[PDB]
Symmetry: C3
Subunit: 257 residues, 3 copies
């Protein structure tokens, strides 16, 4: 801890750094070489840090409508829209597990209020209300005006990803990385009185083949509920667009690189 | 300072690694050499990562009954069944502090509806309702059927531990590590209709001398509430057995190895 | 085992910054998404973790802590609503941000502890103090189980030029004016009803911190909605004043 700056022994480094051994130890039980299975499972396979961040974002958080859903990899059950645990179906393409889904179940109260949401489904286009075989449907909806505004103005970006190409890591919500959605949303925001302007954010997806579409402005939430029969992957919505950030963060945290 | 493989200086390791200094620095105040007392106490002595993970598990989580209790080491007060801070009494064997307890207080509503829970008390057997002098009493209760099922079927595992041999670390819930509780519990689940079967989890305890007993199937929760006057160490219960995993995680997180 | 490590070995033994980055990395990009960085203490996921729950719900805390963080746009006010931040500057340095307090639904109550920080508005004196940051700490002196209503506060005013979030804490151990006074005041109560004394410690020279007399009713119950507010957080149980310090510590970088 004391010396200026020269090559460290293993013992010195174990003293200066946070070790993986120490991280394992947070969860280790009864002097066993492995973390308990039922813990590993819901814990991103040991990652207590990721799990910590993720956990509160997933639950409660005050302005988020009645139960987020994120079906994670390597698990048996996930909680649906009503907060209940249901069986996961995992989906294969080319011998690889791409994703899981569950029955949406019953959203007690509609989305509302001038917020932002990211929803992801298997084969069920929420906008068009139609099935798209072998695609994953990504939907981002948001207020364009601020919570304090007196203008009702909303929009959405959307795209469909062939299941073979699907990769959780290549999706994000952004206000800085250039792409069709950010550009469109930026133009859409600028239609409002300056005082009522949001910080534009877009649906960025970097998977070749896929183009992301952005709607026109709406003055009414593009999506209010989700049919309970819906094969659902991920669903999260704040009542306050000012916090759209946390929704990107949740999603980023839900799935491994 | 990132692309090569041999022999790092202290200064390089401090850039490449997450350091203890930085972790200390999340909690440091006023350029002082130690973390503030009143913060160290409830923070597992500065372990902010542990504390992060633990915190949300300990509170709210929408399917857990009205207030988990985990009396932690080296603290003044713990919150009881009613969520109120009451004085901890610490217990000594052979000049070593083994564990603390509090008056259980008042569970507003009964445990209920096909869940799982772990309870640990000082000297009070919750099943036999009698005092066992110098024993620590472990009770794990669970549904055998799924939440979706139409069968009321419940069981519990239990054992008593001599206070001198007590070790928070040698207990866990498991579905993989071989033991008498897992075995019994496996056989018990297999008495149900395939579609209603849960993944069996047993109470595992590696303290020599101790044997863990498992009940027969019950169809009615082995345990519904806790007498207010009870000396309580740990109590946690979910309404949904499918998440019994979190209960193991919480417990694992509450006590240091 | 017990000899000089290569960078590959270090990366296998240590938690790396690269891995921490990767908790939040998206789309193979060299930076963490802005809207994510912003509310995340710039990528510090561990800090953000601990902070998050401390800031929200937590059972015994009155209807919405406020803590205006650095480098953000909006912060949640007393009502739980997101409002615009005004950042304040002294000598080309950003010293702090504030928001209109807004409407605290229910009054602070029942034998707790609160830390409050306002720009220029002394909540006790109810008067403007130009160029000062106002720190107020209020607490029960007796325990929740007690049958005595006894309260006190400590307070000080800090010139905006000298303001540093890091030189403030709540303490029961580090010697200071507020600790001493607070210990004396506690010791006027029946032993069984005695709290563990904690003081408002502030290590910015020029500033002295005043501690009140004992009250028998809370020195502060509410906050005028117009108040320029920086930090606000109150538990109903004084036994947990520890968590209020931890929330504060976690809200601002060293």
């Amino acid at each position: 801890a004391l010396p200026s700056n020269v090559k460290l022994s293993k013992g010195e480094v174990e003293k200066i750094a946070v070790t993986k051994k120490e991280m394992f130890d947070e969860l280790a039980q009864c002097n066993l070489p492995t973390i308990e299975l039922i813990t590993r499972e819901h814990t991103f396979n040991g990652d207590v840090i990721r799990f910590a961040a993720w956990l509160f974002l997933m639950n409660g958080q005050k302005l988020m409508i009645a139960n987020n859903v994120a079906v994670r990899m390597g698990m048996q059950y996930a909680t649906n829209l009503a907060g209940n645990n249901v069986k996961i179906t995992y989906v294969t393409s080319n011998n690889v597990v791409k994703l899981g889904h569950i029955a949406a179940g019953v959203l007690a109260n509609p989305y509302s209020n001038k917020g932002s949401g990211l929803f992801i489904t298997y084969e069920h286009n929420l906008i068009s209300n139609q099935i798209e075989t072998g695609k994953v449907c990504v939907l981002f909806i948001t207020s364009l005006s601020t919570t304090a505004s007196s203008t009702n103005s909303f929009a959405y970006s959307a795209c469909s990803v062939p299941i073979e190409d699907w990769d959780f890591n290549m999706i994000k919500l952004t206000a800085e990385t250039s792409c069709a959605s950010l550009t469109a949303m930026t133009n859409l925001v600028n239609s409002l009185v300056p005082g009522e302007r949001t910080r534009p954010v877009g649906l960025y997806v970097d998977i070749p083949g896929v183009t992301v579409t952005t709607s026109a402005s709406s003055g009414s939430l593009p999506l209010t509920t989700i049919p309970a029969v819906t094969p659902l992957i991920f669903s999260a919505y704040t009542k306050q667009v000012e916090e759209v950030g946390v929704i990107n963060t949740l999603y980023a945290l839900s799935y491994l690189p």
